[PDB]
Nucleic acid binder design. Structure first.
Ligand SMILES: [Zn+2]
Lengths: 121, 191, 171, 148, 52, 67
RNA sequence: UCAUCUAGACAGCCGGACGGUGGCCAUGGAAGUCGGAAUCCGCUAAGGAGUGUGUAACAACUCACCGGCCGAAUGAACUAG
């Protein structure tokens, strides 16, 4: 049961990595569920946002390491609270939308991985 | 269930030096030195690399492996007490009669005297254990600070000063008068 | 006592209505043949409608340990009668042979639950062929990599009533 | 400048809210009654926007209200205060229309989902001639296009 | 009146305790069993009765 | 200065530890500990001295400094 | 006997704990939390048509759920020496 839900997560992640060349790693701190929900709706058409336990994710990437070897570079960046954005749009347009939306007294993009290349941005 | 090997670690900072013959611990640091007899607890010590010391017990019962973590906490308290020091802040609490606290000297022994606690004519004197320094703090009303190296000596002196001001033959939920410890910390806290 | 394991095979006495009964077999830990056959008939009277007057024993054979110098982990399933009821227990013992394992089992039950030989029923004993199927911590403790431990506080018993120096408990 | 939202059974406290805005209770009630007309009979959320002189009343769309209205209902005085349990026909088109009416207001996840949520909102309504409300929603893909 | 914070600090030691129902011992507020031997370390505890 | 402890090492029991049989039928020969049964007994073997491979209580042997 | 567990468990800190929806009756009110029934979806990593505090009703706070630190066993009920 728990394992079954977990197995599904592993599979979807693999599919997402294959589906979108552009990957954005986003760090969320003090972001409300409502704040997150709005961002998801704005980016529903061009982006996929994935949230998961890091321990779960690292194992998955290692499991899928033989295929898509360049994704290994993303693993150091995975540490800390993180989210994964998979998008057709290459870079800035997605980034601009994420930072701007729902800033209240705050989503940040920690790193960008595109086509096997990592950008601090 | 006779745990055949359980083992804890203590970290030794750069400033201190710890000397352990049989079960007598001497910790020497910047603020001074402290010692401790531990011949009642039956553990074994082992220096690893001059900043780590493991303490272990072999074939121990449940009470014995409880005592292992206890003695680790005691020697670690000694190390952090000789590095950062220990400071207990206590506050004076009264309704009508103000508590008047001074420091007197019968035969040069540094007594703390307490006057007018709930208006009585009796004068409460608590002695001061050695190594504990007492300062009546400014800029906060009615606050006393006890500082030292030994957490045992500082907290015991603070507890003696708290217990000397107990109210008799009254409802103590209404007669809340006394001297109560409000803060426990280090002399160089947030170092 | 010091236990031995026997197979005991018996059957009912053959009648004209039914010759060749079904030859039941059981494994008994006992001190000797007499106690082994008594325990065999005890458990067959608990299982089937037979008794010693109505049946016979066709074979009794001692089964000694196949590898008496291999260190095994055994899982043992046991019934015992307490002072208020009957309970099932599973205990696992790291030991070198089956008879010694059930000897330490009988000592363990008599020590920890005050259960006697008349109260303990041995359901089964089986070697656990794989590690990480071991479920008790007191035996899983001894399965770690490079297990080593000291023996503190050596006490040497003396032959003389007087010793001429203060003894040492270094080991 | 100031917006106040209240759930009001139509045809009609209000005064306490009105005093802060310095608006006559009767005037507000009349305006609300006119707004409720649209369906009315049943409780509906009403939005009042205050211009610092007068308050304008509009009826905000609510799933329960729209669903209750869709179930055909004989007008009820409510003097009886009966249970007034609501029984409804499948009304698949009406629910799809309701989902469209919501138009993913407040970000419903999908057009089909908005309809599914609308179906859930019919906890009160039977919502089907022969089925539990939204029981078959997962089963049938029909009407997904209609909601969009 | 003492002060609100000072009443809180004094009531931390005087009023925010628990009482064993068997032997009337004054106990920590989050305790589960009495620390006394004479009641047999019982778990019959009640909050200390406040004013107001 | 540097931190000083008294190490107080003694004669660990593990595989390859050479022991001397104190009492029994061997009673004075050498053996090597092959495996550890539990806290109180070990499987030893003494094949040069003629000690048969056996499980033995740790109170019947003395551990030597040889490993 | 049930459960959780190196795909990260139980304590401890820190963050989120959301929309349809103030779900349906009933009340002068009761919007998760006076009660009666039902108790379903979306977004989800995750969030009960609600565990309490909580207000006239709100608002607000906290929960059981998911996440970072921790890295390994732990929780509940019961039995008997
Ligand atoms: Zn008690």
């Amino acid at each position: 049961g728990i394992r079954e839900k977990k197995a599904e997560y592993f599979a979807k992640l693999r599919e997402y990595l294959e589906e979108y060349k552009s990957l954005f790693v986003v760090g969320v701190d003090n972001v409300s569920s409502q704040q997150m929900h709005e961002v998801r709706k704005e980016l529903r058409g061009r982006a996929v946002v994935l949230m998961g336990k890091n321990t779960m994710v690292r194992r998955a990437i290692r499991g899928f390491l033989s295929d898509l070897p360049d994704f290994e570079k993303l693993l150091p960046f995975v540490k800390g609270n993180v989210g994964f954005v998979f998008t057709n749009e290459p870079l800035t347009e997605i980034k601009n939308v994420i930072v701007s939306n729902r800033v209240a007294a705050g989503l940040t993009v920690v790193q960008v991985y595109d086509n096997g290349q990592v950008f601090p941005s | 269930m006779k745990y055949i090997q359980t083992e804890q670690q203590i970290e030794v900072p750069e400033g201190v030096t710890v000397s352990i013959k049989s079960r007598i611990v001497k910790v020497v640091g910047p603020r001074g030195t402290l010692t401790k007899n531990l011949k009642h607890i039956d553990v074994t010590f082992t220096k690893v690399n001059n900043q780590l010391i493991k303490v272990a017990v072999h074939n121990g019962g449940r009470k014995h492996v409880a005592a292992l973590r206890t003695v680790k906490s005691l020697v670690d308290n000694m190390i952090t007490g000789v590095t950062k020091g220990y400071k207990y802040k206590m506050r004076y609490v009264y309704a009508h009669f103000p508590i008047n606290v001074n420091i007197v000297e019968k035969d040069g022994a540094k007594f703390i005297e307490v006057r007018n606690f709930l208006g009585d004519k009796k004068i409460r004197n608590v002695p001061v254990r050695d190594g504990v320094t007492i300062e009546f703090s400014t800029n906060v009303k009615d606050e006393i600070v006890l500082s030292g190296n030994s957490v045992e000596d500082v907290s015991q002196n603070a507890a003696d000063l708290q217990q000397i001001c107990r109210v008799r033959n009254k409802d103590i939920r209404k007669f809340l008068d006394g001297i109560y410890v409000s803060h426990k910390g280090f002399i160089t806290e947030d170092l | 006592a010091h236990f031995k394991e026997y197979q005991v095979i018996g059957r009912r006495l053959p009648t004209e209505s039914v010759p060749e009964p079904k030859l039941f077999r059981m494994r008994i830990f006992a001190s000797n043949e007499v106690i082994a056959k008594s325990r065999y008939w005890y458990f067959l009277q608990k299982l089937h409608k037979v008794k010693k007057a109505s049946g016979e024993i066709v074979s009794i054979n001692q089964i000694n340990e196949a590898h008496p110098t291999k260190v095994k982990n055994f899982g043992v399933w046991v019934r015992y009668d307490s002072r208020s009821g009957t309970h099932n227990m599973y205990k696992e013992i790291r030991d070198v042979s089956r008879v010694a394992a059930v000897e330490t089992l009988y000592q363990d039950m008599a020590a920890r639950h005050r259960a006697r030989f008349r109260s303990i029923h041995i359901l089964k004993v089986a070697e656990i062929e794989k590690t990480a199927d071991v479920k008790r911590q007191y035996v899983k403790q001894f399965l770690t990599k490079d297990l080593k431990f000291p023996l503190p506080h050596r006490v040497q018993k003396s032959t003389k009533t007087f010793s001429y120096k203060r003894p040492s408990t270094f080991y | 400048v100031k917006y106040l939202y209240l759930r009001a059974v139509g045809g009609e406290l209000a005064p306490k809210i009105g005093p802060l805005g310095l608006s006559p209770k009767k005037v507000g009630e009349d305006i609300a009654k006119a707004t409720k007309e649209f369906k009315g009979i049943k409780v509906t959320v009403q939005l009042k926007i205050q211009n610092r002189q007068a308050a304008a009343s509009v009826v905000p769309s609510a799933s329960s209200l729209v669903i209750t209205a869709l179930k055909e209902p004989p007008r009820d005085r409510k003097k009886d205060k009966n249970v007034k349990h609501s029984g409804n026909i499948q009304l698949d088109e009406i629910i799809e229309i309701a989902r469209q009416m919501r138009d993913k207001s407040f970000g419903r996840t999908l057009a089909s989902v908005t309809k599914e949520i609308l179906g859930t909102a019919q906890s009160v309504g039977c919502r089907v001639d022969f089925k539990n409300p939204h029981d078959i929603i997962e089963g049938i893909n029909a009407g997904e296009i209609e909601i969009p | 009146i003492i002060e609100p914070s000072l009443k809180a600090l004094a009531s931390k030691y005087n009023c925010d305790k628990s009482v064993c129902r068997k032997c009337y011992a004054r106990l920590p507020p989050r305790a589960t069993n009495c620390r006394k031997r004479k009641c047999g370390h019982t778990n019959q505890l009640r909050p200390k009765k406040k004013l107001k | 200065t540097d931190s000083i402890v008294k190490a107080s090492n003694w004669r660990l029991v593990e595989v390859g530890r050479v022991v001397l049989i104190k009492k029994g039928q061997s009673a004075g020969k050498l053996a090597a500990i092959v495996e550890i049964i539990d806290q109180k007994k070990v499987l030893i073997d003494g094949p040069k001295a003629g000690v048969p491979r056996q499980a033995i209580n740790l109170g019947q042997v003395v551990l030597t400094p040889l490993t």
